[PDB]
Ligand binder design. Structure first.
Ligand code: B12
Ligand code: B12
Ligand code: B12
Ligand code: B12
Lengths: 196, 195, 197, 195
């Protein structure tokens, strides 16, 4: 409901009003709630508005940068607990960061030390870092399907002892082909990781 | 203080984000906001860049460090004043994905009471002018790390994005700014003075 | 710790002398509510509980001093992150005899956040000295925060008139009538202050 | 003449310039050094200028508030170690804070958990806080002598097992009368406390 107001504030360059509206939502729904009720709907509307030609790239950039900033702040508010890290990123060629940041946030909320790398990490580099840090897991967020299609069979299999793949670009069959565990629900990710 | 840069980078490369945050706050408290960016954030960023280019670290390690430093700068940006009145749009040229210079410029402006709107990097020029016109922006500021994206632009391309257009970063120089129709500025402090 | 509990947590941290813990809780609040929000939803409620606990006799002045000093330091830190812009300043202080500084610092902070060069002088400034500084710096306004009403009672009618081209008075110690008596504009909401400029 | 420059910046309301000069001093002399070479000489010049009538109370206030803020930041950079605290304040009626903050800083630099309360604490309330926190010591800074003269004999005696009094307002006889240990040198404070 609040999404229209927030987007209108952003598109008129009223940063203070956007942040105030976002804080109101955060106070009302709480951290998880504001992400499902406000952040994600606005992100989606920005996407759709762009594709319809109602807004241009500058406006989309402004809105996306604002939402990233808000999500980064929630990520840091969940804080960084001890223990072997989980590396969170996106496949090579994937620049959509929000899904990855959400996954890191839901993990940290459950006491999992999710290290958000940013998007678009080469698989050998990722595997090397996981090995060196003794990471328990790698979590990948895929918005587009093409970057997954470009990977060879089994490519995600041994990035770390456990590898999870989600996002709208992914499905069970493609996860199976790549050797990743497929997950749709962020709230359950920590439990899936703690389980064998 | 002499050791904060080494300490911060080592903390990052071992995935000690809590340690890295504490060291960065120490730098912030010692040097102040502008100072920590000059004396800590930028030297560490540069070292990360050079280590990558020498092949000493991979992209995952660089990403870890870079993402953390971006987050810190964004946080300072949001703590600055955002005053009302005609904004200044801050971004990078099309094809330029290095964003930290643009964020720094937005930060220095906000610290001086200029309503700098950071768009993120890599904004098409027709879209930038549309938003500048629609918001009645007084200026556009572009940060260029690489020179190639500027060379790809036609003469006069930046000329009337807004009433004033500023170009800086290591990718830019006075001649290229003149060719593109932008004002060249080398020092971030001088940017705010120019307005 | 739920946001609803950060106030209790922060006060408990202070009352046991755990400054490191208090700072962590305050940063959590800052990240959750944002800069203005943490002041309204954490700093001010804690200060009020401290005040009420003192009046009930549960804590003394030393505990209040510890909490006030800590919260002042946090607000000062936010003030210095806002950046100080150029242009004719707004001088921010409290009336003579008024040693409560938080209201004044809050006013300076809200102004700086909106790009107004609010110069915080500290509290308790003699009126002739204040007027002299305003004219020398060409200050566009003076802002006074009054927590208690007694320091305003001590001032003669019209005392705040033309300290500067605009003079604003607020805080729990002030009301529109005392403001009218003293020759100041009354403002109740810190947000309205920036708009008035 | 960083000190001259800093004071001139403050008296003209150039807070950004004053902060930059202070950071320069901090970077050159370091934490202890900037206090000796910059903070204290400026405070004394402010004092002298006021007494000569060259500046008013508003200017003094502005400079004092700025220096307090800088010293609070150094206090927080020193950190707060664990263990039973030392409470640092000033006598009732004493509103001068810098001396007390300096004492807290020298203690924290030596790993002593010096809790700065702010100035002007009633003695019963101070004793109650020391008791409740199990404080090992109380440290008082006195600039003026009158606030000490107003106190009854033995008033400071058992605020904690160790009670130290210093500052220009204090001396050995008055410390003896009040039941405090008199100390002149900040550097020596933590050593006095350990022995
Ligand atoms: C927003 C959006 C954009 C915007 C804004 C997003 C941004 N700023 O990051 C921008 C303009 C950025 C964008 C870019 C593009 N996108 Co677009 N746009 C969308 C839109 C509307 C939403 C996508 C999104 O980011 N959602 C948020 C993400 C986080 O949600 P999600 O993946 O559904 O994940 C959910 C769950 O799976 C879970 N989750 C996410 N990750 C993970 C991981 C794990 C492990 C788990 C358990 C859960 C989980 O959390 C999420 C919320 O519950 C969709 C259409 C739609 N309505 O869905 C397209 C869509 C993704 N876009 C599309 C396209 C084509 C593009 C572009 C290539 C277009 C172009 N020519 O530039 C570009 C850029 C390519 C690139 N790499 O740069 C297509 C892709 C089609 C395909 N077959 O792959 C889509 C699907 C449109 C459509 N319905 O046809 N897009
Ligand atoms: C530091 C650095 C980084 C930092 C960059 C931070 C950033 N710029 O966003 C990090 C580690 C993030 C990085 C990442 C990458 N970069 Co890099 N790295 C470098 C390095 C060492 C260049 C220095 C630099 O970026 N300076 C930082 C900026 C902020 O400083 P500056 O531009 O001098 O600007 C200063 C002033 O001009 C002023 N300023 C800036 N903008 C403006 C604007 C105005 C108006 C004004 C007044 C002032 C002003 O403020 C700044 C501080 O003083 C070079 C190698 C070299 N030159 O020695 C590469 C280099 C630029 N990187 C390169 C690449 C390819 C990358 C990566 C793709 C590598 C990777 N996969 O890990 C990524 C891309 C990430 C991204 N898309 O953002 C290549 C580019 C090759 C090419 N010709 O295309 C280089 C040349 C390295 C190499 N030899 O291969 N990089
Ligand atoms: C901290 C404190 C002290 C500290 C102050 C430290 C410091 N340097 O800041 C010290 C030790 C000095 C102190 C001493 C005294 N104080 Co006292 N203490 C407090 C306390 C806990 C502080 C309140 C505060 O700092 N901020 C809260 C203020 C800013 O909020 P506010 O006034 O509601 O104002 C709001 C708006 O009006 C607006 N605003 C503020 N200024 C301005 C300006 C403008 C222009 C605008 C638009 C808006 C605006 O912003 C605020 C947020 O919405 C309060 C308890 C309380 N409930 O406040 C008492 C309280 C004010 N103190 C009280 C008393 C009695 C005293 C003493 C007289 C008693 C004594 N001898 O100990 C002395 C007198 C000292 C003096 N002459 O100033 C009482 C007052 C009794 C009463 N209600 O009338 C209170 C209420 C405590 C209680 N009884 O519960 N105190
Ligand atoms: C700043 C200042 C104020 C500020 C204080 C603000 C603040 N929050 O800090 C304000 C505006 C409040 C102020 C007001 C007043 N003050 Co005044 N002002 C000064 C000033 C300029 C400070 C200078 C100073 O001494 N700083 C340094 C501190 C640290 O003291 P110091 O001399 O350096 O002592 C050193 C050591 O003693 C050591 N130290 C300190 N504490 C301790 C503790 C221990 C254990 C140890 C080992 C060492 C130690 O550290 C210091 C640095 O090395 C002085 C001018 C001056 N000559 O210094 C006056 C001065 C002290 N003020 C003075 C007076 C009288 C007043 C007022 C009475 C004026 C009035 N008309 O109201 C009021 C009284 C307020 C009160 N009730 O206490 C007189 C002192 C009179 C006297 N000889 O007794 C002075 C000297 C003015 C002058 N130039 O004549 N003042």
């Amino acid at each position: 409901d609040l999404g229209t107001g927030l987007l209108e504030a952003l598109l008129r360059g009223d940063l203070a009003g956007a942040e105030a509206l976002f804080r109101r939502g955060l106070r009302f729904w709480g951290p998880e709630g504001v992400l499902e009720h406000l952040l994600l709907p606005v992100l989606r509307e920005v996407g759709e508005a762009w594709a319809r030609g109602e807004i241009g790239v500058a406006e989309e950039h402004l809105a996306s940068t604002f939402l990233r900033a808000r999500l980064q702040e929630l990520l840091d508010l969940a804080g960084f607990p001890p223990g072997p890290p989980v590396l969170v990123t996106t496949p090579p060629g994937e620049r959509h960061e929000i899904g990855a940041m959400l996954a890191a946030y839901h993990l940290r909320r459950k006491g999992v030390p999710a290290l958000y790398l940013g998007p678009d990490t080469p698989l050998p580099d990722l595997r090397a870092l996981a090995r060196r840090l003794g990471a328990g897991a790698v979590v990948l967020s895929a918005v587009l399907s093409e970057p997954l299609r470009a990977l060879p069979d089994g490519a995600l299999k041994d990035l770390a002892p456990r590898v999870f793949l989600g996002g709208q670009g992914a499905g069970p069959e493609e996860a199976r082909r790549l050797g990743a565990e497929y997950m749709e629900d962020l709230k359950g990710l920590a439990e899936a990781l703690w389980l064998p």
